[PDB]
């Protein structure tokens, strides 16, 4: 439904109006370092983006994984 989108980095809902929200998709590495059909997916709000804070935060979470 219309009310089920939540930001991964700031843990609050994203409103339908936010032009600066974006979704980031990345592939997963294969054995011997090649590519695969499976995707990482992140939903990120505009508030982090206006500040500049997203650069470091994403680097943290790829390490967490």
């Amino acid at each position: 439904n219309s009310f089920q989108r939540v930001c991964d980095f700031s843990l609050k809902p994203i409103s339908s109006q936010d032009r600066s929200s974006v979704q980031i998709n990345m592939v997963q590495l294969d054995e011997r370092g090649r590519a695969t059909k499976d995707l990482m997916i992140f939903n990120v709000s505009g508030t982090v983006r206006k500040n500049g804070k997203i650069d470091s935060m994403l680097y943290e979470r790829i390490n967490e994984m």
Partner: protein, 220 residues
Amino acid sequence: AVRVVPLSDKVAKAMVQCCCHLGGVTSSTSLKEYIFGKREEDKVNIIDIKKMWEKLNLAARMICSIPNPKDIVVVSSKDFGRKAVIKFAESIGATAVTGRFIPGSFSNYEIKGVREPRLVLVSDCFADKQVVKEASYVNAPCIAFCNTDNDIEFVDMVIPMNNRSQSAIGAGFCILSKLVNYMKGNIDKVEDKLRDHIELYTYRDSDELEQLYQEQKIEE
């Protein structure tokens, strides 16, 4: 740890000759995490190699995620860094913009010839400020090469590298091109074609090209 395509000794050497690691004198709270010491003689900050390889790998990964590669838009509005974009985009199937980025050209339907982006790439993003600003209206991520003096709000992936020297610009673009091709299986090893490509991308004056023409013709 992050799963990254392995470093190889000649590649490492290559970047060091290309002077990728020489930052400026200033630094920013966003970029402290990439520096590893300062030159006692010069006050120049030195960039961490292992981190540079990491974010280069991370960029490559997400370039692979978007079908119909034409929808990737590469921009770089400066000579001294021009031809790199023109070749790089062809190596992956992307579209490009070369001169002044006409403001409104993503926003406004009437301005022809530039596609609605799904991913924007920028080099030396002190110029091309408009491009980073405008992509924000159309829900596109942004990837930029950047240096310790400068800082950006909307850039999602900041690849750290020298951006103020023609040696350096060539190195970043040349390597990243190869990774994207490798990740897809278009090539079998990355050390294959170093001095050929890295030179092709490197910027040269008209005055040099005259000399090289005359030399080449004498050799022919």
